[PDB]
Write a protein that binds this ligand. Structure first.
Ligand SMILES: N[C@@H](CCC(=O)N[C@@H](CS)C(=O)NCC(=O)O)C(=O)O
Length: 110
């Protein structure tokens, strides 16, 4: 394959590839607590990157803006695809559309 054009990009590619569910988050953001919440509800473990605990948080926020079209947290990724923020997470879940997205993630043995 190919390499991203910066460490920011690489990092986002990397963690979004190694993980079914990724939440780029802030510890102080209620929409992030909401999204994390629905995932705990489902019983899906996920990877969190707290951008306010990261020395490069602002640069990562910029990269997520370029990739996903919004800089707001949370930026939620299922199976390499950004599904949007907290309301999207919540709303997909309420419509029973989320668990299927999660179920498309390759299985442990693969
Ligand atoms: N509609 C968005 C709203 C999320 C949101 O407003 N996050 C706030 C903090 S809770 C934010 O991005 N502030 C700008 C920033 O943190 O840089 C969603 O559901 O995720």
């Amino acid at each position: 394959p190919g390499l991203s054009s910066s460490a920011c990009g690489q990092f986002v590619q990397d963690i979004v590839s190694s993980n079914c569910v990724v939440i780029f988050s802030k510890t102080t953001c209620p929409y992030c607590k909401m999204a994390k919440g629905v995932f705990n509800e489902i019983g899906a473990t996920y990877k969190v990157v707290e951008l306010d605990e990261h020395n490069d948080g602002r640069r990562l926020q910029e990269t997520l803006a370029e990739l996903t079209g919004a800089r707001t947290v949370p930026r939620v990724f299922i199976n390499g695809q950004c599904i949007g923020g907290g309301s999207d997470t919540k709303q997909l879940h309420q419509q029973g559309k989320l668990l299927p997205l999660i179920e498309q993630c390759r299985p442990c043995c693969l």
